[PDB]
């Protein structure tokens, strides 16, 4: 059985997480682990509870791990116990995957010097002090790393490791199956394509975060130097 | 605040829910319920574990009610307590929505009767039976109904949703807050693109669970013809 583990944290942003699980338990022999430091319950930034399936000590060997992001990625920035766990089992895996500010977990944990990543839009700036290439592109792909941005990154590269586990025609068949074809109703899921103003009001939104997340990401990075 | 509730049903397809979940909850002023029965854990059909918040008896009027789809609606589409639940909450929602098989559910509580509504592809000889004029459209609207059909037309609608709730300029920025832009690698997402070869594999692995569900359909017909 392939062995899939997702990271599961207390304010993940949980669509990060459950798009990719939904398409990937769709597979057959796979096993897909939601990991945390106990099993357990976890309350996602929303409020929506959800239940990690088993420990960091406990979890097998994992052919692919995904790092999702969220407003908890600040604390996990810093959380060493965490960050040595990414590091173990990114050393045996097959596929390091992240969605949206997931890449600054991987970061932190030093998995991204060298390597072309991504992350969200309003973070951008923190992947070059973590020793990252940043690219602006959706899903960047260096080896076995994919960093992906958007609320279906996630369920987009799922498919793309279906085709490269199994092949093409399980991935297109797990496609028709969930009748996956999005056609959003606005276009404005890139600052690229949005409006001006909207521009605006989001990045006012995020500027108390940024500000935070930079502080924790100097810190981190200082780790990593030494 | 505006009152928006999701049943939340054993063997449910979690992302179904999950997604416009986490749109929806993005939004000011808004509360979010996890419906079911009682408060409690409730398992989706890939074994993910999520928790219902409220029971039918202490739901407050909702705004907007959405049935998700998956394995269990089965079991849904016979279940009197649920089938008055989503009767009497329908009654005066501004907006009654489904996504995939969810539209089974609402077709056996008598919903649909006259309305134009789609559903997943594999079951959409199930609709008429049940007094619909079956419409093979993404997104089909009908009065303040709302059927769609994909792991994605919960979030596009709900963006949908939030424009008209609130104003165009607040669901761009929602939209821009999630980065959410799709680019599936495939384009095997509906039966019309994909490979006839995958087609096949689809609707033979459904075979079984159609049988099923026609049976139980022509039971729920017979509910609502007395
Ligand atoms: C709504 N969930 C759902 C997903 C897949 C299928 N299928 O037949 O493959 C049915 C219902
Ligand atoms: C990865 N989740 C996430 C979603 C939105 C934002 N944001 O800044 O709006 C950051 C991270
Ligand atoms: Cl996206
Ligand atoms: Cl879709």
């Known amino acids: 059985?392939?062995?899939?583990?997702?990271?599961?944290?207390?304010?993940?942003?949980?669509l990060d997480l459950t798009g990719p699980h939904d398409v990937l338990a769709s597979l057959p022999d796979v096993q897909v682990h939601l990991i945390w430091?106990?099993?357990?319950?976890?309350?996602?930034?929303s409020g929506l509870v959800l239940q990690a399936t088993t420990s960091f000590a406990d979890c097998p060997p994992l052919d692919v791990i995904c790092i999702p992001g969220g407003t908890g990625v600040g604390a996990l920035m810093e959380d060493p116990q965490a960050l040595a766990f990414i590091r173990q089992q990114a050393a045996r895996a097959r596929y390091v995957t992240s969605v949206c500010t997931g890449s600054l977990v991987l970061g932190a944990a030093?998995?991204?010097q060298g390597k072309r990543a991504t992350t969200h839009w309003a973070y951008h700036e923190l992947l070059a002090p973590l020793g990252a290439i940043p690219v602006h592109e959706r899903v960047v792909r260096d080896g076995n790393l994919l960093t992906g941005?958007?609320?279906?990154?996630?369920i987009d590269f799922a498919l793309t490791?279906?085709?490269?586990?199994?092949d093409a025609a399980t991935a297109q068949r797990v496609q028709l199956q969930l009748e996956y074809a999005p056609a959003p109703p606005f276009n404005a899921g890139s600052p690229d394509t949005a409006p001006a103003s909207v521009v605006q009001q989001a990045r006012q939104r995020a500027?108390?975060?940024?500000?935070?997340?930079?502080?924790?990401?100097?810190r981190a990075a200082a780790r990593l130097a030494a």
């Open 1 to 14: 059985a392939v062995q899939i583990g997702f990271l599961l944290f207390p304010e993940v942003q949980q």
């Open 37 to 45: 430091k106990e099993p357990g319950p976890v309350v996602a930034s």
């Open 110 to 112: 030093g998995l991204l």
């Open 149 to 154: 941005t958007g609320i279906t990154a996630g």
């Open 161 to 166: 490791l279906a085709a490269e586990l199994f």
């Open 207 to 218: 500027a108390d975060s940024l500000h935070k997340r930079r502080e924790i990401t100097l």
